[PDB]
Amino acid sequence: FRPISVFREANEDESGFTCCAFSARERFLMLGTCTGQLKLYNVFSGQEEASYNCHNSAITHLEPSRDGSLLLTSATWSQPLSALWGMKSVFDMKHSFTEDHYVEFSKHSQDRVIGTKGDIAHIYDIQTGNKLLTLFNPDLANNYKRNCATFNPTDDLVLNDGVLWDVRSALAIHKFDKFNMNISGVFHPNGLEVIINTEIWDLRTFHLLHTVPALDQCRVVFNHTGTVMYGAMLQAKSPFGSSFRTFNATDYKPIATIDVKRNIFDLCTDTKDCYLAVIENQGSMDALNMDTVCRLYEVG
Ligand SMILES: COc1ccc(C2(C3=Cc4cc(N5CCN(C)CC5)ccc4C4=NCCN34)CC2)cc1
């Protein structure tokens, strides 16, 4: 991990970057801020190229669409709490998700949004904005404090609150046992495995394949090729502590532990898996205000 670039939010006395994603436009990083702004930065110059106020509370999450035409945002205490923005030609709001505190695109064909409201998942059509489907069963809930509903790579399964759902039938096919209080789980890009905190389950047999103690309380991100898994750990200001782990995605063998000595707010990779971007806070949890920097590292 060779540091190649660093920047702080332009002009600000304290720098308020909260989350990041690379744009479909080569060289440009998208960042959310603690004032609900979306900014476009040259990742090498640190030049601010554009600024849009999406929310009147802090951004917690953003996800660009692969074809660069759409963006999802989530905020902290705004109504609406999440939104879908059009980026082709003029930046504008397309739909709003009144109480969903987290949203993602479908993965295969990006024509749907999945939103999370506490223990409940909602699926929406992108063209009409209509809610197609609500996945919730109170007998099956795990009540994960950081529940995030997600699609599998083919868009026909959903993981919500540690329940695996068939999207076509709207049927719960399996409730995974609850072994932590916060992390609800993600699909591996290979479409055969589920990662729920420290447990790696097989989707076809529900055997436990691996225990990875180092993933405890970690939020997991895959590189674009599905060969490396990157993890940063939640705080018992900041959602994460000050270090990140890399794992081999095929055997879950640890490759690296990096302590950046600063609390991490977010990290993401470019679609060619050359660069890792990390939002690190220079201030503590106790400071008046946050003071984040975006650090760009070369990996290979
Ligand atoms: C499964 O585990 C997860 C843990 C956290 C999250 C979320 C999330 C929340 C968040 C709040 C921030 N705060 C700082 C203090 N300020 C007062 C208000 C805003 C700053 C960054 C982030 C953030 N960045 C990337 C993810 N994420 C909601 C998405 C998702 C999953």
Side-chain angles (χ1 to χ4, degrees), residues 1-24 27-87 89-236 238-300:
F1 294 98
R2 187 173 68 103
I4 126 181
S5 194
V6 72
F7 56 97
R8 70 186 269 116
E9 185 177 15
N11 305 147
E12 295 322 73
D13 252 350
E14 286 92 53
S15 162
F17 300 146
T18 52
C19 59
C20 59
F22 283 91
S23 71
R27 270 189 92 232
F28 295 89
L29 185 70
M30 280 165 142
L31 294 110
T33 73
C34 72
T35 60
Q37 296 189 289
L38 166 86
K39 301 212 146 136
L40 211 91
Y41 274 76
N42 192 286
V43 82
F44 305 101
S45 51
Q47 180 93 282
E48 187 168 302
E49 293 289 344
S51 195
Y52 306 107
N53 188 47
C54 295
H55 303 280
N56 293 329
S57 74
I59 315 287
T60 58
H61 170 63
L62 66 72
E63 186 196 353
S65 71
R66 293 204 293 281
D67 63 0
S69 66
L70 298 176
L71 178 78
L72 287 164
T73 61
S74 307
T76 299
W77 61 264
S78 293
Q79 197 287 100
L81 207 52
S82 293
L84 179 64
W85 306 87
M87 303 212 286
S89 143
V90 162
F91 191 92
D92 78 317
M93 208 179 77
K94 267 217 63 212
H95 297 299
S96 86
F97 310 100
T98 178
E99 290 191 299
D100 296 347
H101 55 70
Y102 185 80
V103 286
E104 310 190 338
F105 290 115
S106 57
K107 296 186 151 87
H108 188 27
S109 183
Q110 304 199 295
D111 58 13
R112 281 145 158 207
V113 173
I114 179 154
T116 312
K117 186 178 162 220
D119 291 330
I120 300 163
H122 294 137
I123 292 173
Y124 304 98
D125 179 57
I126 281 184
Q127 244 182 62
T128 68
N130 296 339
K131 177 179 299 178
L132 303 177
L133 199 65
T134 295
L135 307 166
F136 178 59
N137 178 345
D139 304 346
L140 282 190
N142 283 318
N143 304 122
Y144 284 117
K145 310 205 167 111
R146 321 287 322 240
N147 180 49
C148 299
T150 180
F151 277 114
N152 70 333
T154 56
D155 308 333
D156 36 20
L157 300 177
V158 166
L159 212 49
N160 180 52
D161 209 30
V163 179
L164 180 74
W165 294 83
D166 186 278
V167 176
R168 326 150 198 126
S169 50
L171 269 186
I173 90 109
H174 187 69
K175 186 182 169 302
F176 290 95
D177 289 299
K178 170 170 199 184
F179 298 107
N180 89 112
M181 296 296 296
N182 301 306
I183 310 285
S184 63
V186 310
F187 290 100
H188 193 291
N190 69 27
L192 302 182
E193 305 170 349
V194 163
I195 301 119
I196 308 187
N197 198 47
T198 59
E199 285 60 75
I200 319 258
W201 304 99
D202 193 284
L203 261 185
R204 293 144 324 164
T205 71
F206 303 128
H207 290 190
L208 176 73
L209 303 161
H210 309 271
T211 314
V212 190
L215 285 183
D216 190 28
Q217 294 315 294
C218 285
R219 211 218 178 185
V220 159
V221 182
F222 287 89
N223 70 0
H224 284 84
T225 74
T227 63
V228 183
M229 189 181 66
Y230 287 91
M233 138 159 66
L234 305 170
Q235 299 275 16
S238 181
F240 319 93
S242 94
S243 79
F244 75 80
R245 302 232 176 55
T246 69
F247 309 91
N248 188 297
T250 301
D251 60 359
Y252 298 97
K253 278 198 218 319
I255 294 155
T257 297
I258 324 296
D259 169 45
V260 296
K261 300 290 182 84
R262 285 180 295 284
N263 299 319
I264 295 169
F265 278 32
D266 202 12
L267 50 80
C268 67
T269 76
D270 71 297
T271 80
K272 319 232 189 145
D273 291 344
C274 296
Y275 296 115
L276 168 81
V278 185
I279 309 300
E280 306 171 12
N281 194 6
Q282 291 196 108
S284 62
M285 315 264 274
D286 313 334
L288 210 52
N289 291 280
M290 68 178 66
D291 196 21
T292 55
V293 307
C294 182
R295 266 199 162 73
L296 188 73
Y297 308 90
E298 201 167 272
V299 317

